[PDB]
Amino acid sequence: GNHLSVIYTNLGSCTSVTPEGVTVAFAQTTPGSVNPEPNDYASVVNECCFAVYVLS
Amino acid sequence: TTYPVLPYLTNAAYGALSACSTCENPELNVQGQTYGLLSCINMPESCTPGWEFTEV
Amino acid sequence: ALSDGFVRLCIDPSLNFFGEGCKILVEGQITDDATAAENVVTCVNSELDLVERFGQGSVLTESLRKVFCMCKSGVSVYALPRADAAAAVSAVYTLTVTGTALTDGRVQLYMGEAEYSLDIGVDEGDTPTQIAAKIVAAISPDFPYEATAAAGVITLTARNGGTIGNHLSVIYTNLGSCTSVTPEGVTVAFAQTTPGSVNPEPNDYASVVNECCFAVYVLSSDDTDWQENLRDWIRSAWDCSKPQCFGHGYVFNKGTLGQVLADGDNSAELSRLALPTTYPVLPYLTNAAYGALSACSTCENPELNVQGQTYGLLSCINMPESCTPGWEFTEVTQLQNNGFVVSGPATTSGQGNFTSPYIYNDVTNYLRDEKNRPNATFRDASSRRLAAATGVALATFLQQFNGLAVFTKNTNIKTGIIGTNLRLMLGKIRKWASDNVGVLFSEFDNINEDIQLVSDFDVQPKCVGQPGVFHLNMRYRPPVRGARINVNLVPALFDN
Amino acid sequence: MAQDALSDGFVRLCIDPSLNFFGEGCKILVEGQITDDATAAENVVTCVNSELDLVE
Amino acid sequence: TQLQNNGFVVSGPATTSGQGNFTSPYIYNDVTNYLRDEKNRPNATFRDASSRRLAA
Amino acid sequence: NFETADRRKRFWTTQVAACGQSSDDCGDCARPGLQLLCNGEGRITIATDNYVAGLALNILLTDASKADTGCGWTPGNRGGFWGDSFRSDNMRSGSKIRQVTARGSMRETVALIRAYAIDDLKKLVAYGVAKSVDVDLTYQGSNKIDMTIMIQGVDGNESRVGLTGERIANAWVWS
Amino acid sequence: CNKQNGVKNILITFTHCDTGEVIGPISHEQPDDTLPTYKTCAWTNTALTNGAVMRSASNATMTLPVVRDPRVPLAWYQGCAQIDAQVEKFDGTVMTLTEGAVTEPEESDGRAVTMTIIAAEIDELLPPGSLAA
């Protein structure tokens, strides 16, 4: 959870009209610390044929 | 570093498209604007490309 | 819901116009009151947004107004505002009223452009100069110059700093015999007091227009260095080092014949408009009109020449007939031969009567070549447009070979396989090239030699080439647009 | 990015009028006098390129 | 709209008035109460009533 | 007198997205209607822009008289408008796109829909509002179908001389 | 080997008219010893008196006997679909055709199909070293 992004889309004048005198600022204050490191693949996926592996 | 989308969404969509829903025939590549379009992910337009051509 | 029928229409929500593929960019100065951020491309919607978004009577607003008047619906507009230099100096002009009106009458002026004209009636006789100079209360706000009415003399100060405020020649057709009785005794004197000093030199096009395609660039400035930077950027768009965005730019040069010719820097990517020293219309307005007319408001067909009195008529601009053609015919020929664009009145009328200008030739200020010997390959703007169109069209056609099996060693394709070899690929491309004759190409000199296809294995040395890579070489000619025939009369007199 | 057709990178396009497909033709050598204002060195074989390159 | 989306039959007056004049009702949509499937995915195979009649 | 002699005015005009857009899981749709314009002290007023676009919407979004079938229709929804019996131009109001029926493959049905659309919008030239109209329809698959309608206008003041056709009457709307 | 007279490759592309389906170019093989024939001059001369002639429209046609592919319906090879064909001979000549149509189809036993195709024009690629432009 260290890759968020927020953008003020309406800042650039377009067909849509933004209210005047309103501003939004986005910033971070604390990063992520620890992640798991599982190493039990040989036991949970023991000898079964998969096609694709996705790691989030 | 300035990607406007959560990284794990794009990776998961690419993996899901790559080799299960489009690879009943292995020889097919996943490229181009037709066979490699992640139609389920939407990001805002922008003039800046993110990666400079030399970096690409 | 709650309705009967088979079809369910889904109207596009307010996208009343497409305006896609055709884009125009306008760059110019602005004033302090403008709310638009500097050096940031923004989309322009209509005339309502103006003034507020780009200040009152600014160069950018004046240029945009003309663009919208020419380009009503067919194109999408963009603006790139710029700020004044650090130490810019605004020009000052003086217009003094001397006489005392001893007869009721009317006074009318013409400055810069017809939209800014005025007409006020002198109150009565015996009104002095102080009561005169009410002209200031009549000058339209949009005029880029500010009036002061300094108790008998009106001062005009440019609203934008720099050299952009050194172009005026007032025409005041009242004096002399006039049915609208000229207030007898009143005479006006016109003179300059202070010129412009400094112009900006932005050099960050790679950042603010990064990888965005624009059909036409319009620049409302006369700084040679600024124009040179724009030309360099356009070259990068036509470069071979990366995918190309293409595009073309319009600029103007003003001065005597000797000065104008000195600006011909063999720019193949620009169409320089030549104007005389005494042009009775503000320069950047005419340049914007020419750009807007050609900026896909007429050039959706790449091969359409913007010339003549039917297609190259800048209708939105009205100016009084000049007492002298301005460009003597001896000078018109030289400018055309040197790659400049020359314009003149569209209709012949008596001196002082209103007319409109039109464009003689559409040329791109292209001469010579990298390999120094001369030619005229890109002498016409249509050539640049056609060259870009051919590239995009050809790239689309070749897409069908993407991901297709190719045989190069054993050319016999088994039964049932889907593939092709070099000869079949070449034959298909020749069919496409020949079919487009009369639409994108003229008749090929020798169609059997102007197209070649070679696999990368036949170019690189042994064990250095890559599989499935080809090199295609094509040479074409744009459609012919002229012909010269010499004739003889030979009036005979003998019977047989 | 660029024109939609050229973005995917399948086609690399180069436009230039100074390239020639056919190999360099036959060679002709011209020999004669020169004046003192000619920058070209004496007794050296050079490659002419255009009519405008003369004089200088 | 909510009832139609959730799969209910909704009826309303046919003619037009607001004044106590006599009218008659008619049916907007002939739809059953089908939603989701034996497996929990959503679909509309048996949404319309005529689907049941056609199947038999 | 002043060259601005054309005194003809322009009345209210329906506009797309006048009441916003209605969103749903399938997509987003416009909700055409009248537009209200407000002043600095109240005094609301109705917009009057894009006359031709407003006229086109009225023609498309209105059921015309239904053809006889031999079984009949209820008197409530026979279609058409009761005011068409007073006009003298010998035409009828509304369109008939919604009256198509599934015939043959989807390709045939779509082709028929295009035919009706052209046959309805052709009335624009008859009134004289526009000098030409054409609709381009593309079939791309089961669910994605797109159509585009092109309407040609003219400037308020004649500028070109020597036209093969004629200057359309009722061009004071200049569109 | 250049003096050998024969056919080397035959590619055909089908475009169904009622559904818009497109099938990539499939190689084919001929059923017997006969060869395809061509007519590229789209103007016909008629003999008048004393050496004069008359021009008439006519078309450019191709006769292409090929073996049916067992993965394509027999209807397509007849007048129920568009055809784009290419034939490459041993010497090097290539003859391309696009937007062709089948005319007056005859009964076929299921393997051997003889197609008569007419198109606006047929483009020919002579081997290297041609004379005409």
mmCIF file of C-alpha atoms in Angstrom, chain C residues 73-391:
data_model
loop_
_atom_site.group_PDB
_atom_site.id
_atom_site.type_symbol
_atom_site.label_atom_id
_atom_site.label_comp_id
_atom_site.label_asym_id
_atom_site.label_seq_id
_atom_site.Cartn_x
_atom_site.Cartn_y
_atom_site.Cartn_z
ATOM 1 C CA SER C 73 -16.736 24.112 -36.691
ATOM 2 C CA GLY C 74 -14.212 21.952 -38.558
ATOM 3 C CA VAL C 75 -11.188 22.154 -36.233
ATOM 4 C CA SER C 76 -10.207 22.018 -32.563
ATOM 5 C CA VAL C 77 -8.211 24.919 -31.125
ATOM 6 C CA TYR C 78 -5.414 25.086 -28.556
ATOM 7 C CA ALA C 79 -3.522 27.944 -26.907
ATOM 8 C CA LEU C 80 -0.084 28.261 -25.291
ATOM 9 C CA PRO C 81 0.057 31.566 -23.391
ATOM 10 C CA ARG C 82 3.402 33.235 -22.714
ATOM 11 C CA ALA C 83 4.431 36.003 -20.328
ATOM 12 C CA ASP C 84 6.265 39.252 -20.987
ATOM 13 C CA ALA C 85 10.033 39.524 -20.730
ATOM 14 C CA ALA C 86 11.663 40.654 -17.496
ATOM 15 C CA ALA C 87 12.535 44.185 -18.678
ATOM 16 C CA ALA C 88 10.075 44.771 -21.513
ATOM 17 C CA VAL C 89 9.289 48.352 -22.544
ATOM 18 C CA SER C 90 5.901 49.289 -23.994
ATOM 19 C CA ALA C 91 5.748 51.471 -27.093
ATOM 20 C CA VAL C 92 4.069 54.886 -26.998
ATOM 21 C CA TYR C 93 2.254 56.751 -29.779
ATOM 22 C CA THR C 94 0.871 60.289 -29.918
ATOM 23 C CA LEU C 95 -2.149 61.681 -31.788
ATOM 24 C CA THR C 96 -2.602 65.431 -31.280
ATOM 25 C CA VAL C 97 -5.715 67.447 -32.152
ATOM 26 C CA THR C 98 -4.974 71.062 -33.072
ATOM 27 C CA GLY C 99 -7.830 72.999 -34.652
ATOM 28 C CA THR C 100 -11.070 74.372 -33.244
ATOM 29 C CA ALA C 101 -14.238 72.888 -34.733
ATOM 30 C CA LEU C 102 -16.111 75.808 -36.315
ATOM 31 C CA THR C 103 -18.789 73.666 -38.003
ATOM 32 C CA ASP C 104 -20.862 70.675 -36.909
ATOM 33 C CA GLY C 105 -19.563 67.435 -38.348
ATOM 34 C CA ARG C 106 -18.413 63.880 -37.751
ATOM 35 C CA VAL C 107 -14.992 62.331 -37.141
ATOM 36 C CA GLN C 108 -14.102 58.731 -37.975
ATOM 37 C CA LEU C 109 -10.828 56.825 -37.636
ATOM 38 C CA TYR C 110 -9.364 53.499 -38.752
ATOM 39 C CA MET C 111 -6.496 51.900 -36.822
ATOM 40 C CA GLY C 112 -5.080 48.391 -36.935
ATOM 41 C CA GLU C 113 -8.194 46.532 -38.050
ATOM 42 C CA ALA C 114 -11.719 47.255 -39.246
ATOM 43 C CA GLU C 115 -13.237 45.789 -36.073
ATOM 44 C CA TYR C 116 -11.645 48.653 -34.113
ATOM 45 C CA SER C 117 -13.007 51.549 -36.184
ATOM 46 C CA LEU C 118 -14.929 54.387 -34.551
ATOM 47 C CA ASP C 119 -17.307 57.177 -35.529
ATOM 48 C CA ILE C 120 -18.329 60.038 -33.226
ATOM 49 C CA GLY C 121 -20.124 63.246 -34.161
ATOM 50 C CA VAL C 122 -18.617 66.574 -33.174
ATOM 51 C CA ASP C 123 -21.063 68.213 -30.781
ATOM 52 C CA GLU C 124 -21.386 71.647 -32.409
ATOM 53 C CA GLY C 125 -19.266 74.462 -33.765
ATOM 54 C CA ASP C 126 -16.667 76.265 -31.671
ATOM 55 C CA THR C 127 -15.813 73.107 -29.706
ATOM 56 C CA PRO C 128 -12.088 73.261 -28.842
ATOM 57 C CA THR C 129 -9.547 70.455 -28.837
ATOM 58 C CA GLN C 130 -10.204 69.800 -25.139
ATOM 59 C CA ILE C 131 -13.836 68.874 -25.788
ATOM 60 C CA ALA C 132 -12.494 67.029 -28.813
ATOM 61 C CA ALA C 133 -10.307 64.019 -27.971
ATOM 62 C CA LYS C 134 -13.565 62.411 -26.835
ATOM 63 C CA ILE C 135 -12.389 59.708 -29.276
ATOM 64 C CA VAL C 136 -10.867 58.117 -26.177
ATOM 65 C CA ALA C 137 -14.354 57.456 -24.807
ATOM 66 C CA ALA C 138 -15.201 55.731 -28.116
ATOM 67 C CA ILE C 139 -12.162 53.492 -28.685
ATOM 68 C CA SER C 140 -13.200 49.877 -28.262
ATOM 69 C CA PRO C 141 -11.705 48.101 -25.216
ATOM 70 C CA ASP C 142 -10.303 45.267 -27.346
ATOM 71 C CA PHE C 143 -7.799 47.624 -28.988
ATOM 72 C CA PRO C 144 -4.336 46.465 -27.796
ATOM 73 C CA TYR C 145 -3.431 50.109 -27.089
ATOM 74 C CA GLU C 146 -4.547 52.177 -24.097
ATOM 75 C CA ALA C 147 -5.823 55.740 -24.474
ATOM 76 C CA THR C 148 -5.315 58.496 -21.903
ATOM 77 C CA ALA C 149 -6.598 61.812 -23.340
ATOM 78 C CA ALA C 150 -3.911 63.985 -21.753
ATOM 79 C CA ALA C 151 -5.893 67.220 -22.131
ATOM 80 C CA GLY C 152 -5.578 67.865 -25.857
ATOM 81 C CA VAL C 153 -3.357 64.950 -26.931
ATOM 82 C CA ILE C 154 -4.237 61.250 -26.706
ATOM 83 C CA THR C 155 -1.457 58.798 -25.836
ATOM 84 C CA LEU C 156 -1.529 55.189 -27.052
ATOM 85 C CA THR C 157 0.558 52.703 -25.054
ATOM 86 C CA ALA C 158 0.903 49.061 -26.047
ATOM 87 C CA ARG C 159 -0.647 46.625 -23.581
ATOM 88 C CA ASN C 160 2.145 44.105 -24.288
ATOM 89 C CA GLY C 161 5.844 44.820 -23.959
ATOM 90 C CA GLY C 162 8.529 44.071 -26.497
ATOM 91 C CA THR C 163 8.918 44.692 -30.202
ATOM 92 C CA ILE C 164 5.350 43.520 -30.905
ATOM 93 C CA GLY C 165 4.175 47.127 -30.502
ATOM 94 C CA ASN C 166 5.963 48.835 -33.408
ATOM 95 C CA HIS C 167 3.398 48.524 -36.220
ATOM 96 C CA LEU C 168 0.916 51.292 -37.035
ATOM 97 C CA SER C 169 -0.112 53.546 -39.912
ATOM 98 C CA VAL C 170 -3.377 55.388 -39.259
ATOM 99 C CA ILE C 171 -5.741 56.147 -42.149
ATOM 100 C CA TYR C 172 -8.037 59.119 -41.489
ATOM 101 C CA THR C 173 -10.107 59.726 -44.631
ATOM 102 C CA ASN C 174 -12.089 62.707 -43.258
ATOM 103 C CA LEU C 175 -9.884 65.665 -44.236
ATOM 104 C CA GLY C 176 -10.629 67.156 -47.626
ATOM 105 C CA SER C 177 -14.038 67.352 -49.231
ATOM 106 C CA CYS C 178 -16.571 65.172 -47.401
ATOM 107 C CA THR C 179 -20.367 65.035 -47.389
ATOM 108 C CA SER C 180 -20.228 64.228 -43.682
ATOM 109 C CA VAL C 181 -18.941 67.736 -43.076
ATOM 110 C CA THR C 182 -15.437 67.554 -41.666
ATOM 111 C CA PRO C 183 -15.234 69.909 -38.662
ATOM 112 C CA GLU C 184 -13.558 72.789 -40.453
ATOM 113 C CA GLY C 185 -10.120 73.667 -39.115
ATOM 114 C CA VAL C 186 -9.426 70.449 -37.183
ATOM 115 C CA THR C 187 -6.279 68.565 -38.187
ATOM 116 C CA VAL C 188 -4.690 65.477 -36.633
ATOM 117 C CA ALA C 189 -0.967 64.755 -36.313
ATOM 118 C CA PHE C 190 0.446 61.266 -35.754
ATOM 119 C CA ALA C 191 3.915 60.412 -34.458
ATOM 120 C CA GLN C 192 5.826 57.880 -32.364
ATOM 121 C CA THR C 193 7.791 58.604 -29.194
ATOM 122 C CA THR C 194 9.094 55.317 -27.754
ATOM 123 C CA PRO C 195 9.695 51.863 -29.297
ATOM 124 C CA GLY C 196 9.607 48.368 -27.854
ATOM 125 C CA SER C 197 12.683 46.873 -26.219
ATOM 126 C CA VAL C 198 12.736 43.168 -25.317
ATOM 127 C CA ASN C 199 11.021 39.940 -26.400
ATOM 128 C CA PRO C 200 10.930 36.553 -24.633
ATOM 129 C CA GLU C 201 12.895 33.562 -25.917
ATOM 130 C CA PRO C 202 11.208 30.400 -24.622
ATOM 131 C CA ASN C 203 13.134 27.227 -25.434
ATOM 132 C CA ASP C 204 11.139 24.501 -23.663
ATOM 133 C CA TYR C 205 8.929 23.083 -26.412
ATOM 134 C CA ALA C 206 10.154 19.551 -25.684
ATOM 135 C CA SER C 207 8.523 19.752 -22.236
ATOM 136 C CA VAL C 208 5.153 21.441 -22.808
ATOM 137 C CA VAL C 209 4.306 19.795 -26.164
ATOM 138 C CA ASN C 210 5.989 16.493 -25.347
ATOM 139 C CA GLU C 211 4.763 13.756 -27.706
ATOM 140 C CA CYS C 212 1.557 15.553 -28.685
ATOM 141 C CA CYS C 213 0.588 15.794 -32.351
ATOM 142 C CA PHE C 214 -0.474 19.145 -33.813
ATOM 143 C CA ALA C 215 -1.406 19.774 -37.433
ATOM 144 C CA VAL C 216 -0.534 23.489 -37.599
ATOM 145 C CA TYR C 217 1.511 25.809 -35.380
ATOM 146 C CA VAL C 218 0.733 29.540 -35.450
ATOM 147 C CA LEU C 219 3.150 32.011 -33.849
ATOM 148 C CA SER C 220 2.115 35.614 -33.167
ATOM 149 C CA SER C 221 5.572 37.148 -32.934
ATOM 150 C CA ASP C 222 8.291 38.660 -35.116
ATOM 151 C CA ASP C 223 11.389 37.677 -33.116
ATOM 152 C CA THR C 224 13.748 35.797 -35.424
ATOM 153 C CA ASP C 225 15.311 33.871 -32.536
ATOM 154 C CA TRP C 226 11.883 32.776 -31.297
ATOM 155 C CA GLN C 227 10.943 31.573 -34.784
ATOM 156 C CA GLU C 228 14.255 29.732 -35.131
ATOM 157 C CA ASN C 229 13.490 27.733 -31.982
ATOM 158 C CA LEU C 230 10.077 26.769 -33.363
ATOM 159 C CA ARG C 231 11.655 25.537 -36.599
ATOM 160 C CA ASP C 232 14.101 23.364 -34.654
ATOM 161 C CA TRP C 233 11.238 21.771 -32.723
ATOM 162 C CA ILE C 234 9.308 21.008 -35.916
ATOM 163 C CA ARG C 235 12.368 19.257 -37.353
ATOM 164 C CA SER C 236 12.375 16.985 -34.304
ATOM 165 C CA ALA C 237 8.783 16.020 -35.123
ATOM 166 C CA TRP C 238 9.881 14.969 -38.628
ATOM 167 C CA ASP C 239 13.018 13.261 -37.291
ATOM 168 C CA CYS C 240 14.011 9.661 -38.006
ATOM 169 C CA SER C 241 15.115 8.862 -34.434
ATOM 170 C CA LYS C 242 11.599 8.102 -33.156
ATOM 171 C CA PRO C 243 7.906 7.962 -34.128
ATOM 172 C CA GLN C 244 6.931 11.172 -35.892
ATOM 173 C CA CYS C 245 4.111 13.572 -35.056
ATOM 174 C CA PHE C 246 4.492 15.695 -38.217
ATOM 175 C CA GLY C 247 3.195 19.259 -38.464
ATOM 176 C CA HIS C 248 3.733 22.654 -40.087
ATOM 177 C CA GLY C 249 4.250 26.198 -38.856
ATOM 178 C CA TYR C 250 3.315 29.691 -39.993
ATOM 179 C CA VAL C 251 5.297 32.882 -39.328
ATOM 180 C CA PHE C 252 5.566 36.378 -40.795
ATOM 181 C CA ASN C 253 8.412 38.759 -41.623
ATOM 182 C CA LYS C 254 7.996 42.514 -42.077
ATOM 183 C CA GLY C 255 10.327 45.158 -43.451
ATOM 184 C CA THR C 256 11.932 46.390 -46.638
ATOM 185 C CA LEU C 257 12.921 44.012 -49.425
ATOM 186 C CA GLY C 258 16.545 43.867 -48.305
ATOM 187 C CA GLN C 259 15.598 42.946 -44.744
ATOM 188 C CA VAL C 260 12.973 40.329 -45.622
ATOM 189 C CA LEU C 261 15.259 38.357 -47.937
ATOM 190 C CA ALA C 262 17.803 38.115 -45.105
ATOM 191 C CA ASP C 263 15.459 35.818 -43.131
ATOM 192 C CA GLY C 264 15.373 32.996 -45.695
ATOM 193 C CA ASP C 265 17.208 30.319 -43.705
ATOM 194 C CA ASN C 266 16.245 27.426 -45.995
ATOM 195 C CA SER C 267 13.494 26.459 -43.532
ATOM 196 C CA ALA C 268 11.588 23.590 -45.137
ATOM 197 C CA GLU C 269 9.251 23.339 -42.120
ATOM 198 C CA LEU C 270 7.923 26.922 -42.180
ATOM 199 C CA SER C 271 5.828 29.112 -44.483
ATOM 200 C CA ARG C 272 7.116 32.662 -44.044
ATOM 201 C CA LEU C 273 4.657 35.421 -44.971
ATOM 202 C CA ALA C 274 6.249 38.576 -46.389
ATOM 203 C CA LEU C 275 4.704 41.968 -45.615
ATOM 204 C CA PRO C 276 5.733 45.529 -46.551
ATOM 205 C CA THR C 277 6.764 48.296 -44.159
ATOM 206 C CA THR C 278 3.491 50.234 -44.566
ATOM 207 C CA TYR C 279 0.952 47.435 -44.138
ATOM 208 C CA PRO C 280 -2.285 49.112 -42.949
ATOM 209 C CA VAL C 281 -3.282 46.084 -40.844
ATOM 210 C CA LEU C 282 -1.709 44.762 -37.663
ATOM 211 C CA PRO C 283 0.719 41.999 -38.723
ATOM 212 C CA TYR C 284 -0.126 39.053 -36.486
ATOM 213 C CA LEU C 285 -3.822 39.232 -37.401
ATOM 214 C CA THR C 286 -3.130 38.417 -41.054
ATOM 215 C CA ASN C 287 -0.759 35.588 -40.125
ATOM 216 C CA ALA C 288 -3.385 34.051 -37.841
ATOM 217 C CA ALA C 289 -6.022 34.303 -40.575
ATOM 218 C CA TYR C 290 -3.787 32.510 -43.081
ATOM 219 C CA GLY C 291 -2.927 29.774 -40.597
ATOM 220 C CA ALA C 292 -6.524 29.217 -39.513
ATOM 221 C CA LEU C 293 -7.733 28.980 -43.112
ATOM 222 C CA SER C 294 -5.137 26.319 -43.930
ATOM 223 C CA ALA C 295 -5.272 24.677 -40.474
ATOM 224 C CA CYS C 296 -7.527 21.828 -41.572
ATOM 225 C CA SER C 297 -10.503 24.159 -41.907
ATOM 226 C CA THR C 298 -9.754 23.680 -45.606
ATOM 227 C CA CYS C 299 -6.956 21.080 -45.520
ATOM 228 C CA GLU C 300 -8.779 17.892 -44.722
ATOM 229 C CA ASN C 301 -7.778 16.970 -48.273
ATOM 230 C CA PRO C 302 -3.955 16.888 -48.122
ATOM 231 C CA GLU C 303 -3.600 17.849 -51.801
ATOM 232 C CA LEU C 304 -5.667 21.069 -51.773
ATOM 233 C CA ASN C 305 -3.657 24.192 -52.604
ATOM 234 C CA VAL C 306 -4.613 27.314 -50.632
ATOM 235 C CA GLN C 307 -4.207 29.974 -53.327
ATOM 236 C CA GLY C 308 -6.314 32.078 -55.661
ATOM 237 C CA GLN C 309 -9.289 34.315 -54.928
ATOM 238 C CA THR C 310 -11.670 31.394 -54.289
ATOM 239 C CA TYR C 311 -9.671 29.363 -51.750
ATOM 240 C CA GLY C 312 -7.067 31.820 -50.452
ATOM 241 C CA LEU C 313 -9.416 34.652 -49.482
ATOM 242 C CA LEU C 314 -8.882 36.057 -45.976
ATOM 243 C CA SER C 315 -12.466 37.260 -45.771
ATOM 244 C CA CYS C 316 -12.388 38.195 -42.084
ATOM 245 C CA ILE C 317 -9.839 40.978 -42.739
ATOM 246 C CA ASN C 318 -10.967 44.307 -44.208
ATOM 247 C CA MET C 319 -8.537 47.100 -45.077
ATOM 248 C CA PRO C 320 -8.833 50.280 -47.163
ATOM 249 C CA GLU C 321 -7.292 50.345 -50.621
ATOM 250 C CA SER C 322 -3.722 51.624 -50.526
ATOM 251 C CA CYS C 323 -2.433 54.450 -52.706
ATOM 252 C CA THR C 324 0.404 52.240 -54.009
ATOM 253 C CA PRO C 325 0.557 48.438 -54.451
ATOM 254 C CA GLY C 326 3.216 48.268 -51.725
ATOM 255 C CA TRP C 327 5.118 45.378 -53.304
ATOM 256 C CA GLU C 328 6.255 46.528 -56.733
ATOM 257 C CA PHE C 329 5.920 43.807 -59.351
ATOM 258 C CA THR C 330 9.706 43.701 -59.650
ATOM 259 C CA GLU C 331 9.796 42.808 -55.947
ATOM 260 C CA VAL C 332 6.845 40.396 -56.013
ATOM 261 C CA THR C 333 8.654 38.125 -58.465
ATOM 262 C CA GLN C 334 11.839 38.057 -56.379
ATOM 263 C CA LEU C 335 9.976 37.163 -53.185
ATOM 264 C CA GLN C 336 8.142 34.302 -54.894
ATOM 265 C CA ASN C 337 11.388 33.022 -56.424
ATOM 266 C CA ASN C 338 13.053 33.067 -52.981
ATOM 267 C CA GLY C 339 10.409 30.950 -51.243
ATOM 268 C CA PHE C 340 8.257 33.643 -49.619
ATOM 269 C CA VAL C 341 4.480 34.070 -49.570
ATOM 270 C CA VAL C 342 2.996 37.298 -50.946
ATOM 271 C CA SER C 343 -0.577 38.548 -50.577
ATOM 272 C CA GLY C 344 -2.521 41.406 -52.109
ATOM 273 C CA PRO C 345 -5.987 42.895 -52.548
ATOM 274 C CA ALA C 346 -8.696 40.618 -53.910
ATOM 275 C CA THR C 347 -10.558 43.278 -55.914
ATOM 276 C CA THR C 348 -9.554 46.514 -57.624
ATOM 277 C CA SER C 349 -11.361 49.570 -56.257
ATOM 278 C CA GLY C 350 -10.718 53.281 -56.037
ATOM 279 C CA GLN C 351 -8.238 54.620 -53.516
ATOM 280 C CA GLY C 352 -9.564 54.547 -49.966
ATOM 281 C CA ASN C 353 -12.279 51.951 -50.586
ATOM 282 C CA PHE C 354 -12.460 48.808 -48.472
ATOM 283 C CA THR C 355 -11.200 45.484 -49.819
ATOM 284 C CA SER C 356 -9.898 42.133 -48.612
ATOM 285 C CA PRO C 357 -6.536 40.411 -49.161
ATOM 286 C CA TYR C 358 -5.841 37.059 -50.779
ATOM 287 C CA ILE C 359 -2.786 34.838 -51.185
ATOM 288 C CA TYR C 360 -0.914 34.415 -54.463
ATOM 289 C CA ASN C 361 1.322 31.380 -53.879
ATOM 290 C CA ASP C 362 1.522 28.635 -51.249
ATOM 291 C CA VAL C 363 5.248 28.018 -50.749
ATOM 292 C CA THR C 364 7.225 26.615 -47.820
ATOM 293 C CA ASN C 365 10.454 28.655 -48.008
ATOM 294 C CA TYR C 366 12.315 25.540 -49.167
ATOM 295 C CA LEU C 367 15.393 25.749 -51.383
ATOM 296 C CA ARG C 368 18.509 23.675 -51.960
ATOM 297 C CA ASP C 369 19.018 20.380 -50.121
ATOM 298 C CA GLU C 370 21.272 18.713 -47.567
ATOM 299 C CA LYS C 371 23.146 17.420 -50.574
ATOM 300 C CA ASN C 372 23.738 20.944 -51.690
ATOM 301 C CA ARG C 373 22.429 20.885 -55.271
ATOM 302 C CA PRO C 374 18.993 22.507 -55.657
ATOM 303 C CA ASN C 375 15.542 21.109 -56.363
ATOM 304 C CA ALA C 376 11.891 21.867 -55.582
ATOM 305 C CA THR C 377 10.748 18.645 -53.927
ATOM 306 C CA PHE C 378 9.142 20.472 -50.974
ATOM 307 C CA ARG C 379 8.504 23.770 -52.763
ATOM 308 C CA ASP C 380 4.738 23.568 -52.145
ATOM 309 C CA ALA C 381 2.908 23.196 -48.839
ATOM 310 C CA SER C 382 0.761 20.460 -50.374
ATOM 311 C CA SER C 383 3.899 18.345 -50.798
ATOM 312 C CA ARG C 384 4.527 18.347 -47.045
ATOM 313 C CA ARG C 385 0.901 17.447 -46.330
ATOM 314 C CA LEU C 386 0.894 14.683 -48.949
ATOM 315 C CA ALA C 387 4.186 13.263 -47.665
ATOM 316 C CA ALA C 388 2.754 12.961 -44.154
ATOM 317 C CA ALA C 389 -0.474 11.420 -45.453
ATOM 318 C CA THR C 390 1.411 8.802 -47.473
ATOM 319 C CA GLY C 391 3.454 7.715 -44.461
#
